Each structure stands twice: as structure tokens, then as C-alpha cells.
Amino acid sequence: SQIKPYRDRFPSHARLPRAGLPRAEILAEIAAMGAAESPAWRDGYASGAVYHGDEHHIAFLNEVYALQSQSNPLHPDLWPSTAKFEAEVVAMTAHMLGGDAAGGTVCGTVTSGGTESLLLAMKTYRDWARATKGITAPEAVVPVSAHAAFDKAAQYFGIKLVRTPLDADYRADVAAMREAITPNTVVVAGSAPGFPHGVVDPIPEIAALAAEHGIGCHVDACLGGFILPWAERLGYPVPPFDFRLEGVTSVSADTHKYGYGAKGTSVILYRRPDLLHYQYFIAADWPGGIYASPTFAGSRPGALSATAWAAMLSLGEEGYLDATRRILQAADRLKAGVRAIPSLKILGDPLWVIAVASDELNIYQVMEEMAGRGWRLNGLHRPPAFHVALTLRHTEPGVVDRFLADLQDAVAQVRAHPEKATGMAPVYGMAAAAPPELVRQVSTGFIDLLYEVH
Amino acid sequence: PYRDRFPSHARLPRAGLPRAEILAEIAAMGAAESPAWRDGYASGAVYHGDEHHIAFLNEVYALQSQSNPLHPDLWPSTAKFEAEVVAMTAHMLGGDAAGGTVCGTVTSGGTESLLLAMKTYRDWARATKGITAPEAVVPVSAHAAFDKAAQYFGIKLVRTPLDADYRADVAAMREAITPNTVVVAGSAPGFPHGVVDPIPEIAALAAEHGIGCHVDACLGGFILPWAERLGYPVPPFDFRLEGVTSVSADTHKYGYGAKGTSVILYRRPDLLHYQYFIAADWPGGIYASPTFAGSRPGALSATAWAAMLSLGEEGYLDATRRILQAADRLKAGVRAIPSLKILGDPLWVIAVASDELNIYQVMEEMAGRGWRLNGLHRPPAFHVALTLRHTEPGVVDRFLADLQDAVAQVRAHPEKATGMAPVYGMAAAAPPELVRQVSTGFIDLLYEV
Ligand SMILES: COc1cc(C)c(CNC[C@@H](NC(=O)c2cc(C)on2)c2ccc(C#CCO)cc2)cc1C
Ligand SMILES: COc1cc(C)c(CNC[C@@H](NC(=O)c2cc(C)on2)c2ccc(C#CCO)cc2)cc1C
């Protein structure tokens, strides 16, 4: 119920006021909530959530939004600027992701986020495989670690999703993937890296598996697309993961993540225009005129595409290199510190999204102790663990040292009381062992709580 | 047109470009593009457009720019804004008449509200009626998004004909209903001709068959309640009708919020719960989605909340009065040009057609004078969706003078077909496979560097 802390701070609104409220009063309330909320992400207490977070970069993008606020890309005749920004965002991302190696046929679109990029990629493989291979019962083979949006795509578009086991390094077991391929498989996927444990899947081998079966290979680089090319140039071990690989037929990369654009954008890329074409929706007989959508949406907030273009141009190759170096050096420091705490262990060998578990202590209480110190960490299960996705906010002076000091104490306090399960720890413990319908019932109730007006 | 005016960026620059330089380029494009919508030349596209209202919303955006409602623990401000936008919208659309069970979510736009409602009806029907081959019945005039939904979620869409008033023929909708029908829909109003369908009749049809009734009020949700209070004739179209099970309404249209938001409402929580996505076995943790997206631009929900609050009932009533008064004056003027006809009897989205002349040439003559109108087909026509931008001094008078000149020019030369007029003509005559081909090339053209 700390998800509803303004219940007794600001007046609630279940109905429109009769008279319009003063603009200065609306602004005062919003700024007051900003004063309460901003320190958590600004001062480096949030895992992921805010990727850049510098006040001058934010002020720069807020100005870009302001200049382009009326932009709706559904009307390129009215906003040709925005069509230019989206075309250039896609062209620049494709090039960064080995697009020239594919022969200059790499194309794509700007989306509302990573989820849309993954859903669109799944719908496209389903539609392409039906029209060209005649598959009417589509299947998709992905590792267990692959994004929850794959499950969302399966249920929405009627694709059978086959999730395959991981190895001891929390990487996709490719042999398990090969064994799951049937004549109905439309796509195989790999994560670069996956969200739970920040490990990069063996993409060259996943791409070669797809190529030999004549199926799609989607690379989910939503998290790593804007990190991994720079990590490669810096001396860090990163296998080829993009269009440089022959079997790779699509890549998703989030401009609103490490691209450092404003929330609300991502990029979906395909190796060829013939694949891209299956993503489009075209209505030819509607009295409202000829209608064509490249993505899920009709009307779109064009100003957010402009923030993505403005962010990429302001950073350039050097900015992205320098941002990755900072993130990866902060990650190296954090990994070394965690590995020096006796009761903790890191899952796999990640470069910057660090999952921490314990064979000795209840990691959910260790996590709860951190929450008690203001840390906002992602809680994981299968296995129980928490993770920290390092951002530019965690590269600021003293943030990693503050995390390490607070983790040292958290472990000590749980080592003294291993029975302690306070706050959110029993919920996470319950959740990890709960049957799916109990999880479904509790999640439905949590979403309903978010929409409560009192 | 910026091809040679501004340098093209097909690759990231080696070194970052100065922030001031990027802003100067974006502002340059802004100065060239803003007059079209600001001076009232664009049909729909920009719904409010006043400099001070825009400046207020841009400041609301700046204060909430980091907001991501995927994290309500970090941004409880946005979860509150989304709850209150839904509550206020539900109340405005007769939600009280349902005893307090009306609930919903904020979406990215009108398309997502329509897509979400179609998937909810599909999932609800499979779960409770055992329907595995779902169908949906809509008038031919219902948004193209119903076809996107049908194709995405594997629902058979059955489009039914209109009557002489361009309103849905409900007798035809009844004849399309099979035991596999999960939902029927009506528009309030439809986009093509701006006419409200017979929602009472459609909602009665749905209730009688135990199926859902979706009302597409994306365009009219923030106009119609206020049109009613003003004494204008409007068929009841919302939760006042027992048969209506869901309503969609766009806050980013006549709600005057910034682009990127809409609302989907359902009559009951049991219905809404079929919209939600829940993953229970993912190592990334328990994952729940109220809509299609994961991360979302929470700042756009804040602009919707801020707009609704700054206007209130009086603000919406004043905005609707101005738009309806501009529409009355525009419709009267059109009716004083006998070569033209209005399709149906719309309140503010006016479609104009001609039996005597080539309407696509009349449209071309208006485009020459700066007008940005929507070209329609089945039948050939154009439309004007009136906004607060057309309520400004002399915009409708300018429109009617340009329209009188456009008609005199086409009457002088019935054979004239210039600019975009042969394109529209060709496209209205074209087989669907050629329409698909040209539109694909058009999208490829938009992403060309
Ligand atoms: C085959 O040749 C043609 C191809 C096209 C597309 C046109 C123009 N038709 C207007 C249409 N635009 C788009 O589909 C669109 C998508 C993107 C991106 O840019 N434009 C549109 C846009 C919005 C509504 C609407 C609405 C209520 O929500 C209706 C129609 C003309 C000809 C002759
Ligand atoms: C009652 O059982 C539970 C139910 C929930 C939902 C939680 C929280 N789990 C974190 C989860 N959040 C959400 O699903 C969510 C949606 C909205 C709105 O608010 N939260 C999340 C969010 C994002 C990623 C990700 C990613 C890469 O894209 C992963 C997990 C905990 C327990 C024990």
C-alpha cells in the first residue's frame, strides 16, 4: 500500500471538477510528487528504471519533447520532421548492429518499447511463415530466460511457445533448442543479454541452427543493443550477436533503455524488406480511406521518436563508448565486492545486469534489508535471487560503494536471524512456491489496487 | 522535403553533436510545420493547439519525464493519475448507472483500446462459452483497427452495411449473428462520416444474444456528453445502456491531453480481468501487464490528468459549444452549395460528397489553398474533423469562401484532374492487391534515408 501514499496528501479525483482547477495548483502537486520520487532514481537506488538520469540530458530531452509535442507520425504530410527522425533512428541502429554486413537490406521501424518490438517480431514470423511456408499451427522456440513478452505474443497471436532449459552458466542450451524444432517452428530466439541474469545467449550457434532449418532467428538485444557493440570495442568478451551473423533475421533494441532516449521508444529490425512487409497492416475497403500501419498503433506520440534521435546524435559513437566504459567499470567493481561476501553468489558471468543468490541465506530477506535502506532491486524466482541492472546513475561517485556497504550489513543481519521474513520477503517466498492460479489471483488484485480511487 | 535542407543521418556521428545544434534543427522544422495546424488548416490532427495549453502540458511532461508506470513503487504519482483519468472518464460516460462496477485502464491510443477490447471479448468467450472460432460484427464504417484486431487475434470480422443516413443497419447486424459471435460494435461517432450509430438498438441486440457490445467513442467520448447538456440531438451511447459492456474514448483527441493516451472501460471487473497478461514461471520474476505494453511513457498519462483537471466540466462544455457552433456554421454553408452534399447528419466531423462533380478535384482545389483534409472512398468524399483550431476567428468563413471557389472551378472544368485528385481516383478504383502493393511501398518510402 506504499503504491498509494498520496491518499491523505493530495485531494482524490473520481469525477471531473465542475470548474477547471488552476494550472499553478496542478503543477504544484505534480512537482511535490516529483520531490518525493526523484531521489530514489536520481541518487542511484533503482535497478534499471532510469538509464541516463543526468539533469542536463533530461532538460535537453524535455526541450526536444516541447518542440515536437504536437507531432503525430500517422500524419507524415504534417510532420515530415518526425518521419525523418524515425527513418534516421532505424538507419543508425541497424548500422550499429552490423546492418552493412547483411547487404544493405536491413530495414525496420521505431516502436513504443521493447514489448512492442518483440510482439511485432512474433506476429511477423507467424504471418510470414503462414503466407510463405503454409504453417497454420505456428511454434516458437526460446530459452526459459527469454522475456515474458514472448509468452504474451504466444497468447495474443496463437503461437505455441516452447521454452528450453539453460546450462550451468545460465545460457541457452542450444542442443535442447535443436531438439524442440519441428516442421511448424517459425522462429528461434536468443537474448543479448536476457533480463533475469544479464547473460548473453550463444547467438552464433542459435543463428546457425535457424539458418539450417530455414527459420527465423530473432535476437532480443532490447537491453544490450546499445551496450554490446561498445563492450566489444572495449576489450570485454562479447560474441557476434547481430546482422554480422548470416542466420540472424531480426533484432530488437531499445532506444529508451541504453539508447538514453525518453520512455516510449524501441526499434525492430529485419534482415530484409520481404520480412518487414509482414509486420504492416493495410486496410483497402474502409470508407475512412486507405489505411496503413507499420506497427500496432495508429496515432503515436511523435515527440518521443524525436527524443530518441536527439539522444543518439548528442552522444554519437564516443558518448556510447564512454557511457558503456563507465557502466562496465562500475559493474566490474560491484561484481568483485559481491564475490567477496561469503554467503552470496552471482548467477553466470554477466557483464552489467547482476543477479545475486544464496544457497545459505534467504535472499528475499537480504533483498528486503536493502529495500529497508532505500534500494529498489528486481526480485527474481526460478531460482530465488535479486538483480541490479547498472545504469549511468550507478556510475556516479559513491553509488557502488554505498550498495556494497549496505549489502555487507544486509547479509550480516540475515546471518544473525535466518528465520526473519519481514515486509516483502514472505510475499516473494509465497510467490516463488505458489501454484500459477494463486499467482494469477494475487497479480489481478495488485493491478486492481493500482486503479483504486479513494 | 528536408533531404538537402538538413543533413541526413544514416549512421551515428563519431563524436556527439552539440545539444544546442540539435535543438536549432528541430525548432527549424517546428517553425515550418506548426502553421498548418495552428492556423486551422488541418482536419483533426491537433485538437487543442492553444500555445498556453501546450506550454502547460510540456511543463507537466518535464515534471514526469522519467515516469515509467511499469514501476508503480518508484512512480506512485502516475498510478494515481491513471486511476483518476479512468475514474473521471467512466463517470463522464454514465459509469454511475452501472452501480460502481465500471473500471478500465489508460492505453497508448484509440487503436490499443479497440485491440484490447477485441482480445478481451475473444478470451472471455473462449473461457466461458467454449468459443474457439470467434466472430465479431461491426458496421462497414467502424475503424480499420477492428480489421487489425481480427487479423492479430484470429477473430472473424463481419462488416455489415449502412442505411441511407450512413448509420448502421441493425437488421443486417442481427442477420450476421451466429453462436460464434463474441461481440458487436457501434461507433459514437464513426470516423468516416462523423455519425453516431444506433447504439441503443445495437446494445439491445448484444444483451439479447448474451454477447459483448463495444462502443467506439474514441472520437466522441469528450464531445457527446457535453453536446447532450447543450441540447444537441445525440443518441445515448454509453454505460447508461445496460447492453453496453465496454467503451473506448481518446484523451489524446477531444480530451485535449498530449498524443499517446486513450482509455478502455468495461462494465464489470470480471470482463476487465480478461485484458490482463500474467506470467508466473519466468525467471525474471512475477510479471503482470494491464495492457499490451511493458514500459510506458508515464508523462503522457500525467498530461491527460493535468488537461482534464485544468478544464473540468465547464472547460469541456465551453470547448464543445465552440466546436459545435463552428460545425453548425460550416454545415449551413456547405448546404448553400447545391453541387455538394453532406453524408448523413453529423454533429462536427463533416464528410462532403458530390454526385455532379469529382469531389477529389474539389479536395485538390482546397489543398491548393492550404487545406489538409481527409480523403475518403466508398463513396468518394473528403471530411473535416473540426477542432478548437477551427473555432478561431474566420477559419470557417475562410473554409467556405475557398470551398465556393473550389466548386466554381470544378464546375467550369468537369474533366480537370490535377495533383493528388488522379491518385485518389485511381486508388478508389484499384483492386485490393494493388492497394496493398502501393501502401507497402508508401511505408517503405517513409523509412527511406
Ligand atoms: C494507396 O495510396 C494511398 C495510400 C494512403 C496511405 C493514402 C492516405 N490515406 C490516409 C491514411 N494514412 C495512412 O494510412 C498513413 C499511415 C502512415 C504512417 O501515414 N499515413 C489515414 C490515416 C488515418 C486515418 C484515420 C483515422 C481515425 O483514427 C485514416 C486514413 C492515400 C492513398 C491514395
Ligand atoms: C503478487 O506477486 C507479485 C506480483 C508482482 C507484479 C511483483 C512485482 N514483480 C516485478 C514486475 N512488475 C510487474 O509485473 C508490474 C507491472 C506493474 C504495473 O507493476 N509491477 C516486473 C517488472 C518488469 C520486469 C522486467 C523486465 C524487462 O523488460 C520484470 C518483472 C511481485 C510479486 C511478488
Automatic annotation (TrEMBL), chain A:
GO BP, sorted A to Z: carboxylic acid metabolic process; sphingolipid catabolic process
Coiled coil: none
Similarity comment: Belongs to the group II decarboxylase family. Sphingosine-1-phosphate lyase subfamily.
Keywords: Endoplasmic reticulum, Lipid metabolism, Lyase, Membrane, Pyridoxal phosphate, Sphingolipid metabolism, Transmembrane, Transmembrane helix
Pathway where it operates: Lipid metabolism; sphingolipid metabolism; Sphingolipid metabolism
Protein name (database record): Putative sphingosine-1-phosphate lyase
InterPro entries: GrpII_AminoAcid_Decarb (IPR050477), PyrdxlP-dep_de-COase (IPR002129), PyrdxlP-dep_Trfase (IPR015424), PyrdxlP-dep_Trfase_major (IPR015421), PyrdxlP-dep_Trfase_small (IPR015422)
Domain of life, source organism: Bacteria
Cellular compartment(s): Endoplasmic reticulum membrane
MF-aspect GO terms: aromatic-L-amino-acid decarboxylase activity; identical protein binding; pyridoxal phosphate binding; sphinganine-1-phosphate aldolase activity
Signal peptide from the UniProt entry: none
Main location: endoplasmic reticulum
Reported cofactor(s): pyridoxal 5'-phosphate
Pfam families: Pyridoxal_deC
Lineage per the UniProt record: Bacteria, Bacillati, Bacillota, Clostridia, Eubacteriales
Residues bearing the modification N6-(pyridoxal phosphate)lysine: K257
PANTHER family recorded: PTHR42735, SPHINGOSINE-1-PHOSPHATE LYASE 1 (PTHR42735:SF6)
Cellular component aspect of the GO annotation: membrane
Protein topology in the membrane: Single-pass membrane protein
